[PDB]
Amino acid sequence: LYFQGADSCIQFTRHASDVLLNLNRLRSRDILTDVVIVVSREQFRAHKTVLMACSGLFYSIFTDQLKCNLSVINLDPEINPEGFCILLDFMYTSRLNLREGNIMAVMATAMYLQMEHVVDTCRKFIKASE
Partner 1 sequence: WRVP
Residue 67 within binding range of partner 1, rule CB under 8 A: no
Q: Applying CB under 8 A, which of residues 11, 13, 69, 74 lies at the interface with partner 1?
A: 74
Q: Which residues are bridge partners to 42 per DSSP?
A: 39
Up-side HSE of residue 89: CA atoms within 13 Å toward CB? Answer: 11
Best CA proximity match to 37, nearest among 81, 7, 90: 81
Residue 46 is inside which H or E element, if any?
strand 42-46
Taken in order 119, 124, 129, 130, is the CA torsion positive or negative? Answer: positive
Q: Cβ distance 60 to 66 under 8 Å?
A: no
Residue 31 within binding range of a copy of itself, rule CB under 8 A: yes
Residue 97: name its binding partner from partner 1, a copy of itself, none (Cβ under 5 to 8 Å by kind): a copy of itself
Please state the closest distance from residue 130 (CB atom) to partner 1, in A. 27
Size of the site for a copy of itself (CB under 8 A): 40
Residue 109 vs residues 7, 22, 57, 59, 69: alpha-carbon distances, Å: 38, 25, 11, 16, 24
Residue 73 within binding range of partner 1, rule CB under 8 A: yes
Residues that bind partner 1 (CB under 8 A): 18, 21-22, 25-26, 29, 31, 36, 38, 43, 52-56, 59, 70, 72-74, 114-117
Residues that bind a copy of itself (CB under 8 A): 1-2, 5, 7-12, 15-20, 22-23, 26, 31-32, 47-50, 52-54, 62-63, 68, 90-91, 94-99, 117, 121
